[PDB]
Amino acid sequence: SIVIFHFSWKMQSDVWGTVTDSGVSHITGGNFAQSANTINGWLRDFLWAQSSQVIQSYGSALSAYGLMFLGAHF
Amino acid sequence: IWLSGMYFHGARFSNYEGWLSDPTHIKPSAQVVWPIVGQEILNGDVGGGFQGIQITSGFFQLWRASGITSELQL
Amino acid sequence: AHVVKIYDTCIGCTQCVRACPLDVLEMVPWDGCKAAQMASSPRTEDCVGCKRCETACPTDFLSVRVYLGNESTRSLGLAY
Amino acid sequence: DIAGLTPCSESKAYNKLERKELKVLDKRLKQYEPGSAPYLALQATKERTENRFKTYAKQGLLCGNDGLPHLISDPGLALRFNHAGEVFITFGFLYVAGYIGHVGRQYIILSKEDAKPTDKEIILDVPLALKLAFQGWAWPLASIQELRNGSLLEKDENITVS
Amino acid sequence: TKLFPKFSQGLAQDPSTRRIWYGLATAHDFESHDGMTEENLYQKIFASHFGQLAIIFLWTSGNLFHVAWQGNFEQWVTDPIHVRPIAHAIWDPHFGQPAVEAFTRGGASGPVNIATSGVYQWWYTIGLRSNQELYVSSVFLALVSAVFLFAGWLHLQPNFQPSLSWFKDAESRLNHHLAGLFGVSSLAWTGHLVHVAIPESRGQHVGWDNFLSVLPHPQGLTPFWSGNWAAYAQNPDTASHAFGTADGSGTAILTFLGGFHPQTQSLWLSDMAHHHLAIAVLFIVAGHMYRTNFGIGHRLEAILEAHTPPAGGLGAGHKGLFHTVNNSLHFQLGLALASVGTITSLVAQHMYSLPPYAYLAVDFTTQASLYTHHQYIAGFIMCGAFAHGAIFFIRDYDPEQNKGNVLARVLDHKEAIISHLSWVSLFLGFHTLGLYVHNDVVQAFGTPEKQILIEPVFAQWIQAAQGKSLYGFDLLLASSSSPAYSAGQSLWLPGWLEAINNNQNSLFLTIGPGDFLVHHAIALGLHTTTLILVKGALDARGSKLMPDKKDFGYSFPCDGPGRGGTCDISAYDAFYLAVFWMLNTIGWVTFYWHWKHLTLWQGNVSQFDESSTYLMGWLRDYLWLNSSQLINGYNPFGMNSLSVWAWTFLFGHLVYATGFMFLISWRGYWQELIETLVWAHEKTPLANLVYWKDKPVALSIVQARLVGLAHFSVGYIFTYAAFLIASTAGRFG
Amino acid sequence: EIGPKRGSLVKVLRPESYWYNQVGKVVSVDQSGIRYPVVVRFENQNYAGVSTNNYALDEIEEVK
Amino acid sequence: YIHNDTMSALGRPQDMFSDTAIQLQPVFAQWIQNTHFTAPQLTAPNALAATSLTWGGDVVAVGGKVAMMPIALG
Amino acid sequence: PWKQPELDPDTPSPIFGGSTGGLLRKAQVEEFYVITWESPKEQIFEMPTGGAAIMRKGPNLLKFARKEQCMALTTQLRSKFRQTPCFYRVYADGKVQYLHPKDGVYPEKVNAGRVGVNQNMRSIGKNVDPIKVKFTGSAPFEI
Ligand code: CLA
Ligand code: CLA
Ligand code: CLA
Ligand code: CLA
Ligand code: CLA
Ligand SMILES: CC1=C(/C=C/C(C)=C/C=C/C(C)=C/C=C/C=C(C)/C=C/C=C(C)/C=C/C2=C(C)CCCC2(C)C)C(C)(C)CCC1
Ligand SMILES: CC1=C(C/C=C(\C)CCC[C@H](C)CCC[C@H](C)CCCC(C)C)C(=O)c2ccccc2C1=O
């Protein structure tokens, strides 16, 4: 679980994103180096900062992921 | 049997032909849900005049790598 | 150590003496069953408490009981 | 108009919500051709939404302060007004539940009167189960007639430690 | 042979670490100590009681001292709405530059922490107004604590130790506890309310230097000895009346006004005096019921023997119950814990609805912390009551003494009782979970109208029967022609109706379809915890899988892996399993309370009412939305006052996760691991010089369950306390 | 001769047995003066797995 | 991690294991990344470039989105 | 047996490489056990402390730290090679104690030469309750 968490956050904060004429902008704010040193950084900038899509997923096309999210917790 | 099922689903219930002409704008999809209790919302608009469950298996990219144009080959 | 007891509802099948892995129980002669033998436990200080005798007991309820108590170096199974 | 609620026929929140859903579904109609399969699917979903709102309303169902229909469950309070249908008809579940219980109890008693009733549990006796399933339509009559005769319980033949 | 477990030679002769751990576990089980008689047992209990009283008074004395030294009590009295209470000062050499700058709040010169105990409002309400009165009262409480400690030692001496019959005397104990401890103390409290609390609330300073020269009422006892008792309720305090000065004050003392105070939002101080006075008269007149050494009174044994219905409804009735209760200590302990655990919850339910302290409804963190604290305390005490009932059934229940009575009669159908509890729990669980999942799926398919919403027509009917005219039920106390409305129409009904009709306080909050499901969830948790505890108490002395369980004690590991396996078969194990359900039930009731008040305090009462039906709405609008400021205590851009709460919020998570280790992993794996470490330390150079005095061994099975439960409960408590105080303190006052 | 008829179903009266108030078939009754000579056999197995046990003469009652 | 948590909570961000404060750099992996990047010039002459763009310096992007960008280690 | 065979030294111990699980500081400070048996041929057995060892012909003697290890090796030799072993308990001072078989026949036989101990002539379930044995230090089963 820690291995896949490290992969997802590192890719989203240092590789993936979109390139424009004035540089490349990552998916997140590029906060892998300044927020991974603390445990509160993970719980705040990874699990809480992300998962907002899973949380606000009701009524959308990916509505089954919120149901799968709550169901998996049970 | 599972591999044949994935090929048959990509042949009949997918949008591989639409994704083949626009791989950078249409999202992959190879599963359509029947409208029983609600459930129309899951059939998300994936683009290309088709609506279904967006798949993340990479079967379309694999079918692109070894030449496969129509659905008759699938 | 632990306290082992053998009640009179014993049938003398000699299964607890075979299941004991520390040579605690024995079979003494008796005159109250068909086999004319009843179990006993002279080496109670060597009881470890694995309760294999209770699983080997076939009568209902068990004729042998292992009541756990104080622990010593022998009853704790320590090899150091 | 009881418990401080109001009929779904005269609530602004009910109509506001109806228009909200009809609008979010209509926003997806512009992304497709006016005569294809996604267009037909979206049109069918819109018709079902309009029918459901009409069906949910004008049927005595009432909502409260948010347009969501509320349900009255007290008998008497649901009988003095036209609200008996929403939840007081518990007899449907009671009928199906008693049907299941009577069929299972009849299969357990009849199968026990046979040598070794165990393998009859892992390997069902399908002609006996199908016959017992279609014979329990009048289950409350059999339950009241099996209670007065004392053939429903046991006196004192139970594995107890009390 | 060591000498640390002085009370047990068996553990004293243990050559392992098990002697140390167990030496701290059975230290209070006086009933199973080496060479202990009934008289010695009762005398030891009488001493430990005094020790507990001494530490309680010392703790409250220390609280008064700390608030008088660092708290801004004098600054809080002049402005009880804007300023925040101060608990104590913070001295930490580990603090940095920004921690010292950010921890200074409440108008202080150094770093301090705001108090959530709510003692400032309590002291300001009872009459304490200076920073010196807390000082002198703190030294007085320390003095009375010292006296209790001396009294406990005094009674542990020859020619001063009480006998066994003195302990086994219920008539005089009940007479003195109902007359002196419950009645005289209440009479003294209403005397303080009428002599100090009432004049201090009207600006008239009354202290030890002038209370003998200021009369509480103008009439001055003249009506108490005359047929004019209503003179003490002539002019009550008007609406436009400040709680600090005499602007709009009155001269009445024993009034009867329903509702609250217009400025402090608390009950009238001239009503609590009347309340405590009526309670004092009732308790004093009730304390002369039993027969002491006189020619009047009642006999408890005679009442119990006379209470037996004819036609064999209960068989022997209550015959032998007097000797069963008086001869046993766990029965009395279970009854006392049940009563205390019930009234603790009663205190929690009445303090939030009817605030008794001035400016308590304004303090939002104090109310939440006080409610959560009292509810968790009540849950733990309620679990202890059933635990001691199981201990009673195993240790001191002789079946030959009370044959055929109600105690032996309820034991005959324990299977019926346990089975019906199982049915109720299964019903509530299946249906509450099904309704929640149905509303959740229907809400997830983009259709909220489809979700099932049940209006609580029974609790709404009760609220309409008590005065709330929002639902529309034309019933008594809400009508104008009912006999209950005309009765009391001139006594307390206008103030009570004015307080219950307002939608801003917490007195009888407006319920809806979202409270129905949560109330059913609360019912499910209560019936399940009761099922586990009642089953562990009734099946404590035997079962069909193990009939001689009563001969094995109360807390044993198992009875081997035979007969299918007997893991967690003792009553201790049953209580252990019930602690988790108690924690879950209290967590559900506190989540409900905090969310309803969290949505009422911010004027967004329509948020919870429409978003509390589905569990995703609970997880999003309650756990995810209210946790935005808590986790932002310390980020790479600095820190703030909430950082300490943010730290303990994660500290609780770590304690919880460590408890899961002792709960999942069992002793045998760890025993082999410890053996390998022993070989390592013995065959290693330069470290083999030292050696352990006691052989290292793994924790026992029962000990592992206890440590895991302690880690689980500590994490569960610390995490929620951090989130509650941070989420409330972070966005409110 | 002293015990019940061999092959007759009886009821167990031992209050601490797994077959209390149950019905078991008597397989044999010993005639040597032992404490528990009536040996019975039950259709349902106990928690240990056995299906037969021997009871005394006083803890054996006729079925219903 | 717990030390960085306590150092950030106590208001002392200069005493934590981070890139700004007291650091720990993975010099072995940084050297291997450099070796793989400059490897097709001396120890792989027939190879056109590095076997991957994980340690390179040329970010590739298809459709505006980043495909494989160089990865840095801290 | 007919006489307690006194344990004697200078017995050929089995060939075995150095193991790791055995004879710690307790085997010297407190006590340890020793098992002797007679082998009729040359075989390879499994020690209850690690790998496998061979069986030297003639007498055989092994030393262990726990009685359970000697009992485990005893049952292994009795059920896999049909032998008749016997073990002793050596105390710290050097006092040898015969341990198995004490009567010398086997512990699962009768032999009519041993008196029963720790037996209750009552059946389990007829024991009195915890309340009756209060402050008596004794227990229902002990009574
Ligand atoms: C008008 C005739 C009358 C009636 C109706 C009663 C009625 C009663 N008498 Mg009384 N009595 C009468 C005449 C009468 N008496 C006369 C003429 C005399 C002689 C003077 C007495 C003398 C007498 C004595 C001395 C006593 C009674 C008692 C009682 C009460 C209990 C009787 C009983 O068997 O318990 C009920 C039978 C049971 C089997 C109890 C059932 C328990 C249930 C099933 C538990 C279910 C709980 C479950 C969790 C519920 C869920 C609800 C949820 C909210 C939790 C009962 C209400 C006894 C009493 O005072 O008790 C209060 C008592 O000791 N009577
Ligand atoms: C048809 C068989 C049958 C019948 C008549 C009953 C009847 C009863 N059960 Mg029960 N039960 C059953 C099967 C059955 N059960 C099975 C298979 C299980 C294991 C999952 C349980 C587990 C169970 C528990 C844990 C409890 C009960 C309880 C009860 C009593 C309360 C009412 C209730 O509905 O509880 C609920 C019943 C269930 C949740 C079981 C539902 C599962 C289905 C209906 C069983 C499938 C039966 C099968 C289709 C029959 C075969 C048909 C045949 C033609 C082949 C009641 C007398 C409660 C009690 O103690 O008494 C007060 C209780 O706590 N039951
Ligand atoms: C009238 C004489 C008298 C008085 C005043 C007392 C007083 C006391 N006895 Mg005693 N006793 C007496 C006679 C008396 N006894 C006699 C004559 C006998 C012999 C027959 C005994 C035998 C006896 C024994 C054996 C024991 C006591 C004990 C105690 C102490 C009880 C513990 C306690 O403080 O709880 C305080 C109780 C209250 C304050 C009232 C109850 C509180 C309820 C729950 C309501 C809460 C009030 C309110 C809501 C909260 C407001 C506070 C909040 C604002 C902070 C107490 C100080 C126990 C002891 O040793 O000390 C612990 C004990 O073991 N007594
Ligand atoms: C009026 C209150 C009261 C009293 C007088 C007793 C008295 C007794 N209890 Mg009891 N009990 C109570 C309430 C009470 N209990 C409650 C509320 C519960 C529910 C939690 C229990 C549950 C309970 C059980 C399950 C058992 C007893 C047992 C006993 C008996 C001996 C064990 C003992 O006390 O040694 C002292 C025990 C200890 C010193 C252990 C202390 C470790 C605590 C629990 C952990 C502290 C948490 C943590 C470290 C806090 C630090 C946080 C950190 C961040 C700083 C004894 C007669 C035992 C018994 O009957 O004997 C077999 C038994 O097994 N009690
Ligand atoms: C135990 C909790 C629970 C309950 C009470 C409900 C209840 C309901 N759900 Mg729900 N649901 C649940 C759990 C639950 N659900 C869970 C856990 C999930 C997630 C898997 C869902 C997911 C879900 C979805 C997706 C939907 C529902 C829907 C519904 C509604 C369907 C009504 C219906 O089935 O038509 C009628 C069914 C019948 C008539 C069955 C016929 C049975 C026989 C043939 C007839 C009975 C005999 C008859 C009455 C004659 C008897 C005579 C008598 C008078 C004597 C209903 C109010 C649907 C809805 O419309 O929402 C409102 C729907 O969309 N549910
Ligand atoms: C195990 C056991 C035990 C314990 C037990 C317990 C724990 C119990 C409990 C319980 C509980 C915890 C209970 C509770 C209760 C309460 C109640 C039951 C109540 C009441 C009342 C009423 C009836 C009321 C009424 C009213 C009024 C008067 C006013 C207002 C209105 C109303 C209606 C509300 C012991 C030790 C003994 C031993 C035996 C066994
Ligand atoms: C790790 C582990 C051990 C080993 C744990 C040990 C040996 C604990 C001792 C390690 C140190 C000494 C603990 C530190 C002690 C505390 C910090 C303070 C305790 C002091 C209080 C009594 C005041 C077990 O013995 C065990 C037993 C049964 C199930 C699971 C487990 C288990 O998981």
Ligand SMILES: CCCCCCCCCCCCCCCCCC=O
């Ligand atoms: C599982 C038993 C059947 C196995 C053989 C399946 C034969 C299927 C052959 C392909 C059938 C395709 C039919 C598609 C019809 C619609 C064409 C439009 O795309």
Ligand code: SF4
């Ligand atoms: S518990 Fe184990 S060591 Fe003790 S007598 Fe039974 S089998 Fe032997």
Ligand code: SF4
């Ligand atoms: S196993 Fe039980 S019945 Fe058999 S000899 Fe041992 S104690 Fe007796």
Ligand code: SF4
């Ligand atoms: S608690 Fe441990 S020893 Fe006891 S039965 Fe369970 S697994 Fe076996």
Ligand SMILES: [Ca+2]
């Ligand atoms: Ca003052």
